Design an enzyme around this catalytic site. Sequence first.
Site, short mmCIF file in Angstrom:
data_model
loop_
_atom_site.label_atom_id
_atom_site.label_comp_id
_atom_site.label_asym_id
_atom_site.label_seq_id
_atom_site.Cartn_x
_atom_site.Cartn_y
_atom_site.Cartn_z
N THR A 7 0.06 1.59 -3.11
CA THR A 7 -0.88 0.65 -3.71
C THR A 7 -1.96 1.33 -4.55
O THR A 7 -2.38 2.44 -4.25
CB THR A 7 -1.57 -0.21 -2.62
OG1 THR A 7 -0.66 -1.19 -2.13
CG2 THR A 7 -2.83 -0.90 -3.17
C1 LIG Z 1 6.36 -2.15 11.89
C2 LIG Z 1 6.33 -2.69 10.47
C3 LIG Z 1 6.05 -1.95 9.33
C4 LIG Z 1 6.12 -2.85 8.25
C5 LIG Z 1 5.89 -2.56 6.78
O1 LIG Z 1 5.97 -1.47 6.31
N1 LIG Z 1 5.55 -3.73 5.93
C6 LIG Z 1 5.39 -3.49 4.53
C7 LIG Z 1 5.46 -4.83 3.81
C8 LIG Z 1 6.90 -5.22 3.37
O2 LIG Z 1 7.78 -4.44 3.41
N2 LIG Z 1 7.10 -6.60 2.91
C9 LIG Z 1 8.32 -7.41 2.36
C10 LIG Z 1 8.72 -8.56 3.28
C11 LIG Z 1 7.71 -9.46 3.56
C12 LIG Z 1 6.38 -9.10 3.46
C13 LIG Z 1 6.05 -7.77 2.77
C14 LIG Z 1 5.76 -8.02 1.33
C15 LIG Z 1 4.07 -2.80 4.18
O3 LIG Z 1 3.04 -3.19 4.64
N3 LIG Z 1 4.19 -1.67 3.27
C16 LIG Z 1 3.05 -0.86 2.78
C17 LIG Z 1 3.48 0.57 2.55
C18 LIG Z 1 2.68 -1.45 1.41
O4 LIG Z 1 3.47 -1.51 0.54
N4 LIG Z 1 1.32 -1.96 1.14
C19 LIG Z 1 1.02 -2.49 -0.18
C20 LIG Z 1 0.29 -3.87 -0.06
C21 LIG Z 1 -1.08 -3.92 -0.03
C22 LIG Z 1 -1.73 -5.15 0.05
C23 LIG Z 1 -0.99 -6.32 0.11
F1 LIG Z 1 -1.58 -7.54 0.19
C24 LIG Z 1 0.39 -6.27 0.08
C25 LIG Z 1 1.03 -5.05 -0.01
F2 LIG Z 1 2.39 -5.03 -0.05
N5 LIG Z 1 6.43 -4.04 8.71
O5 LIG Z 1 6.57 -3.96 10.08
#
Ligand SMILES: Cc1cc(C(=O)N[C@@H](CC(=O)N2CCCC[C@@H]2C)C(=O)N[C@@H](C)C(=O)NCc2ccc(F)cc2F)no1
Lengths: 223, 223, 223, 222, 223, 222, 222
Positions: free
Chosen positions: B1
């Site tokens: 991000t």
């Molecule tokens: C145990 C576990 C880990 C994770 C994880 O890594 N979850 C990812 C999110 C993801 O894979 N997703 C697709 C499916 C639906 C919802 C979402 C969009 C994350 O949090 N990844 C981090 C590395 C990230 O990319 N963070 C960027 C970010 C910042 C703010 C925001 F609002 C949304 C974002 F994606 N989930 O469960």
Amino acid sequence: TTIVALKYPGGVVMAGDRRSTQGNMISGRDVRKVYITDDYTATGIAGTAAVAVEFARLYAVELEHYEKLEGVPLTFAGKINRLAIMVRGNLAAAMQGLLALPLLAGYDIHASDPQSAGRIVSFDAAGGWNIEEEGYQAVGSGSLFAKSSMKKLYSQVTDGDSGLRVAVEALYDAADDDSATGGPDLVRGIFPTAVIIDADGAVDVPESRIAELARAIIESRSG
Amino acid sequence: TTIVALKYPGGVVMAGDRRSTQGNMISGRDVRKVYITDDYTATGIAGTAAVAVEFARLYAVELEHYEKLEGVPLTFAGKINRLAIMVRGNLAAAMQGLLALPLLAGYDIHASDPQSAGRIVSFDAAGGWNIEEEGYQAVGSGSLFAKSSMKKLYSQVTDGDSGLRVAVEALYDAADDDSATGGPDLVRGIFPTAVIIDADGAVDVPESRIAELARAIIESRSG
Amino acid sequence: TTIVALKYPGGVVMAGDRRSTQGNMISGRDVRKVYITDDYTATGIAGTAAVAVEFARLYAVELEHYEKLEGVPLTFAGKINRLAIMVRGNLAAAMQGLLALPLLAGYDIHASDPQSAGRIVSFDAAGGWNIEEEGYQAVGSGSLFAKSSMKKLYSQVTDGDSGLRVAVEALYDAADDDSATGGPDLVRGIFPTAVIIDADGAVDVPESRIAELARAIIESRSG
Amino acid sequence: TTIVALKYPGGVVMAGDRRSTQGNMISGRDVRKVYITDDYTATGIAGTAAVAVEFARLYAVELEHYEKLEGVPLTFAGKINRLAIMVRGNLAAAMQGLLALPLLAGYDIHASDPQSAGRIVSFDAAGGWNIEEEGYQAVGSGSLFAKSSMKKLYSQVTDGDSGLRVAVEALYDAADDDSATGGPDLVRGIFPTAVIIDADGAVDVPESRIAELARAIIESRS
Amino acid sequence: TTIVALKYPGGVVMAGDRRSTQGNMISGRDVRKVYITDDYTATGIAGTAAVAVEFARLYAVELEHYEKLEGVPLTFAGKINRLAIMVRGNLAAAMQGLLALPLLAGYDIHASDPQSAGRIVSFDAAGGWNIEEEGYQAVGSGSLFAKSSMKKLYSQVTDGDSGLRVAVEALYDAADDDSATGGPDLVRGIFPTAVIIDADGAVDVPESRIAELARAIIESRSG
Amino acid sequence: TTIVALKYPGGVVMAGDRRSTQGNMISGRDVRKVYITDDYTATGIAGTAAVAVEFARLYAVELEHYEKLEGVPLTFAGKINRLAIMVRGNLAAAMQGLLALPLLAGYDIHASDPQSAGRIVSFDAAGGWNIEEEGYQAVGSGSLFAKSSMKKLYSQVTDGDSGLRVAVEALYDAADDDSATGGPDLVRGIFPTAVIIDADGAVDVPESRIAELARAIIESRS
Amino acid sequence: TTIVALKYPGGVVMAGDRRSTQGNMISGRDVRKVYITDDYTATGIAGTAAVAVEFARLYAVELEHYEKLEGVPLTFAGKINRLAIMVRGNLAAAMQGLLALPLLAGYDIHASDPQSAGRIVSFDAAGGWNIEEEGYQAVGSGSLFAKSSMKKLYSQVTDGDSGLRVAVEALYDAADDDSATGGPDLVRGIFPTAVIIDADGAVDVPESRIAELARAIIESRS
Ligand SMILES: Cc1cc(C(=O)N[C@@H](CC(=O)N2CCCC[C@@H]2C)C(=O)N[C@@H](C)C(=O)NCc2ccc(F)cc2F)no1
Ligand SMILES: Cc1cc(C(=O)N[C@@H](CC(=O)N2CCCC[C@@H]2C)C(=O)N[C@@H](C)C(=O)NCc2ccc(F)cc2F)no1
Ligand SMILES: Cc1cc(C(=O)N[C@@H](CC(=O)N2CCCC[C@@H]2C)C(=O)N[C@@H](C)C(=O)NCc2ccc(F)cc2F)no1
Ligand SMILES: Cc1cc(C(=O)N[C@@H](CC(=O)N2CCCC[C@@H]2C)C(=O)N[C@@H](C)C(=O)NCc2ccc(F)cc2F)no1
Ligand SMILES: Cc1cc(C(=O)N[C@@H](CC(=O)N2CCCC[C@@H]2C)C(=O)N[C@@H](C)C(=O)NCc2ccc(F)cc2F)no1
Ligand SMILES: Cc1cc(C(=O)N[C@@H](CC(=O)N2CCCC[C@@H]2C)C(=O)N[C@@H](C)C(=O)NCc2ccc(F)cc2F)no1
Ligand SMILES: Cc1cc(C(=O)N[C@@H](CC(=O)N2CCCC[C@@H]2C)C(=O)N[C@@H](C)C(=O)NCc2ccc(F)cc2F)no1
Ligand SMILES: Cc1cc(C(=O)N[C@@H](CC(=O)N2CCCC[C@@H]2C)C(=O)N[C@@H](C)C(=O)NCc2ccc(F)cc2F)no1
């Protein structure tokens, strides 16, 4: 990384992306992961950049060392087994983080039918290998995306150009879904490298051809 | 991000990228990381997607809650403090991987000078905060690239519009050097989101404007 | 530490800071991190001071050893491979804290066009290396700040004067954001060191030239 | 960080640097580490930024709270005790990295002699405290350099202005030797902050005055 | 497991395989992983069989409980939030191996644009969610293969029939490359589950129709 | 993986599935796990693909090495001892994931009866071995399903043909209950490989025959 | 342990062995693992003896408790859910060695087809369940031998007596291959237990009939 290889009538094509990372950080835009290892062989390696380039360089030297010593190149089976022995020999460092996953492409001048003299050999981290019979293969973090792309496009391959395009497009899909695989950089003019191999031998594909294909794939997906 | 925020004469702008990852795998293309939390403040949050969004939604709720209970909004200082408390309170989950690192951009209706009423507040994971006085700030995996870009480009900020172009360009440099930040996707028509706040309130910047700035940036880099 | 290298038409420049730390404590103010390793090569190392200086010294000895034994110097590709082999051989110690990450600059008297005979080679903690084609590079705890500064300043580089200025100002930005990188000390008269290499060879930039560049930059940033 | 405090005839001075770091990375250039916590008291805190500031804010609020409830301010001893307890309460968290190390400077309006109404009190992470009798003290990563500098400079303190100058110079030596302590930034115009306290109370020393003292020190060392 | 969902003109489809494993052992052939959770909503869950089923049942009850208590069903947004809170709530158990990863499809009777009332929402294990805007999505160990399959096949979707065909073919590719996903069983007459939702509600696709789709796909790939 | 072997009047048959996995992911569809290791011997190997193939290759080279050095082939007992020693030598690696677990099918040219001279030898990961007297055996993640099948079908074995049928149907049941065992792939045309060994030596069974038998079992079940 | 359940036309049968072990040592010979939990339902549990028996006892009391409270018994679904919930409740204990894995057989008096009113439900340690549609199921350390035996024998099941024979023979095969499953003890006269359930309800199968079938199987294999 994503390396892909696929057989087309009378040849093989191998192509590889140009990205190098350290965690999230992009450390390289122009790395070369696909090497002509002899007049009829190209090797593409995923994993730790240093070990990967070292594998490629060492392998080519071993192949040519045999050729000069004995007056004749190794059989293709021999080349397979030497690469496999190298991978097995690196298993311990691989498990400590110095990984090298190769993918071998070649043209077997001793094959009977030149139409299918192309060879695509895949490897695992223990040195296991498989000569691929379904036409294409891929290695690296995007290899699943690339292989699923080629599963759908491979039937379009009827010559060197259609094969080179399917390879480039498969790399395009890989980079689309895998952040550790670099897509085409049109601002910089950096494009995947590609090696093609037929009876006349192994040659690097001019950057401008791959550039052109990349542009056509992009436009095709835009409008 | 990468989230960026910067002061311009009379207002403040905050823009954020759109990428979501799970390791090297790209898991989202259109996530939103910048929210209008009240008529004069936007909050952009890096970290675990679920926790970031939850933070934004809960913070916005708490501000409007205070407002309807007391007949007046919180001072800008109070809003800072409530965000800092939220962050500190999440510290232990953050330690276990549920991280939220926010960035606050707002307009202070109570500042004397309306051209310098813009506020940029950065936070650490322990809830510490700093009202940024050098004009710009960034949070997320790409924030050091975006900061170092804005450091050179910030003298170009002469109004909201050049502020927005500089924010989009900072996010472009971030995506150039950090694979966890997504660049403008001209194939799909997905660009960073942006919020601009001035005396008339906080409003979303329309996609087409950001798209235009993105193509200008790309065609400049591309010579 | 921050070491930077960048190419200009007809040659290359490398420059480095002078700070030594043990934690937060400043243990050195005049250490040298950039060495002329042969008539046409300069090596700048980051990491543990002891191992960095040892690397520079042994590497230069190795290169001259070759030239005396065989009556001719190593090719530039040879020099790269020897350094890389050194880093690789030092890996385990590096994982135990005795780290030495070099950055290699040089002028290849065997290149086709002596105006693009400039060479910048970066390394990772494994033997891995890359020849930089985008004109600049940096190593050390400030390398990200410095490279992002140079990304914005490189368009100004048209000769060795502007190359040396951009290099010193990248080191200034580095020191500005990284406390383990030392900025110019105007009280003590201690400034980064620099080496410039063109077809006439490698030469130490005299301290006074670096001093007046530093003063110019400071006054630029004051007003 | 470096926070210094010293006694001059009829008052006390406290000054602190402005640097905030995360490892080697400079994350702030203008943080305020010395606060007027009441009309005769200033607290300067080293450690985790959020905890340092939280401590200053809650401590000032607490003192004034006693004052409004009971109609009279705490004895100096009671203020020391309240700070010491607040530090002791943070011990578990401090062992986990949320460290707050205070340094107290005040003027005791109920002391016997105005010439000896100045107070400097140092603390440790356990809440233990000591009332400094040797004239000066300091806290933070740079405190040893500041204290060895003051050990040699203290004999020059003969009034408010010379004591302020010795404080700024101590902070200058701290910054010279400790990278987590920021020296004067002549380019941006950011300087250590300082509070001076005497019989008329505690005031913020104006930034210009510290700027002149720093420029004088720099020039002298050139 | 593999669950897919995709949009077609006026509707949405969701389908899921029937396989249950314990390590390499096949422990269920007729399992059901896709559930009509309300008149306009279906949920398909991967993970531990017991958690996934329990999640579906409890979620259905939650929606209908709100509907009877308040005289009106929740907005689609509220159904998303409720599922997300359920997931977040299960995080710690998920880390101890009791995972439930849901996928949500529905038809929004209150859609702003009645043209595109179909909805596809994906979830990560932390409760993060995202409203898919590219037409399809999948969850489970085969989800990458289904997502690349559908990346290539989605343009062929122009009605409910083709949409259901592409869904079942994505499932077929998934099972082709994931042993944890069951393919069609023509010997026992067991085929994937599917649900289709449009303005007239959510309906279970009869098994026989999935049988015909499976046979068409199999004959398509036999020659 | 499932490798099966069974004795029939005057010979033995061995047959193996074609699947390679990494966790749940199918990494190969056409691997060969059954090898003619000499004129009267086949080895099927379960475990790590690389170690399995390496075992088969090394073993065949070793038996022929002896034969060329000494002018005569090793006795069947010796051939067993050499495989068993190889397995024992690999135990350390096998505990770290590099497992080769073989199954030996041979014809003993020195035995008394040319109808009961077929030999099936099972091994464990320490190199322990046992010459199977009950007519059939199997190895690999599907070996329990295969053995419980042959337990019921073995009365139908009367010749090479019926024995091969029972072998392929055992492999079928194995695939039905074990996802690490591949079933017949009618779309691609990949089928288990099989070798049959009798007095005339060891021979590869033509794919088309195994395909026929697979289609007959498939039809039978539906 | 091995517990089997299979459907026959118009009914269902469940059978279980008598063996209790601690490691290699035989600690019980006449344990009962199959319990009539209500007029139309039988439960058999593998796992830790103490927990298995406690589960069956508390489950029967739960169903009868609901029936006396509400004047009506639970629907078949309800009984399933109550068992599944009980199993999930024990998950943590199970993970620490106090395991209870049940198998459920019943006749649903509210079913549509009186010949399709048989019911076999299997469970995992997490409380997942599945209503079996292929005729038979088994739980316990010998359930793969038992299920592979029944895969081949289930065609002979045409009435309740043949179904009982298949149940006992499946158990026999289980004992043949699993040392923790006890086969028929002809010396002591201890044999598997068996419940049959049809429209007239659930009944214990007399020991004399199981002993008869057992000796028929034994003599049949010699
Ligand atoms: C145990 C576990 C880990 C994770 C994880 O890594 N979850 C990812 C999110 C993801 O894979 N997703 C697709 C499916 C639906 C919802 C979402 C969009 C994350 O949090 N990844 C981090 C590395 C990230 O990319 N963070 C960027 C970010 C910042 C703010 C925001 F609002 C949304 C974002 F994606 N989930 O469960
Ligand atoms: C112990 C250690 C690891 C690393 C490390 O992560 N090294 C990176 C490579 C890197 O940062 N570099 C820039 C500086 C010059 C050399 C090189 C080009 C890597 O190996 N990353 C992996 C994840 C990677 O990106 N591998 C891609 C790849 C594959 C084959 C190849 F030939 C080249 C490649 F970059 N360094 O030390
Ligand atoms: C095992 C160990 C390491 C250290 C250590 O950290 N030693 C410091 C160096 C130091 O305290 N010193 C003063 C007295 C002697 C000589 C030298 C100058 C260091 O290595 N610090 C690192 C983090 C550093 O500052 N590195 C900068 C650097 C890079 C290249 C170079 F050539 C010289 C340098 F100082 N001490 O023990
Ligand atoms: C668990 C954790 C630690 C940290 C951390 O290291 N936080 C840094 C502070 C920081 O990066 N920040 C910028 C963004 C917002 C607020 C603040 C200003 C710190 O606490 N560093 C310590 C070592 C430090 O520098 N302390 C100096 C200091 C002392 C007193 C004070 F009041 C303020 C200060 F900055 N964050 O989360
Ligand atoms: C987590 C932590 C450690 C310490 C620590 O070591 N604290 C030192 C004391 C210290 O540095 N101080 C100056 C600043 C203000 C208070 C005090 C005067 C200590 O406890 N040292 C021990 C080893 C010691 O010296 N104990 C002697 C002693 C015994 C009784 C008594 F009443 C006072 C004493 F100092 N404090 O917090
Ligand atoms: C603590 C624990 C976990 C397990 C376990 O792995 N339990 C298996 C399920 C299983 O063996 N079962 C047969 C008997 C009863 C019913 C059920 C069908 C599982 O959960 N396996 C996972 C890997 C799986 O296959 N999940 C697929 C799936 C997804 C959604 C759904 F609703 C049902 C499913 F089976 N057992 O104990
Ligand atoms: C330490 C390590 C293990 C592995 C690994 O899991 N390697 C897989 C095999 C694999 O992914 N491959 C594709 C490309 C190369 C060749 C091969 C075919 C494996 O060994 N899986 C085991 C579980 C397996 O399937 N074993 C089956 C088998 C048995 C005998 C035989 F000869 C061949 C076989 F594949 N890789 O590194
Ligand atoms: C420390 C500890 C060990 C054990 C243990 O292993 N306890 C054994 C049972 C046992 O040794 N016993 C003899 C004394 C009277 C009670 C019983 C008959 C067991 O549970 N062994 C398991 C492996 C077993 O054999 N279970 C078979 C079984 C299943 C269901 C049932 F209802 C009854 C059973 F015996 N329990 O606690």
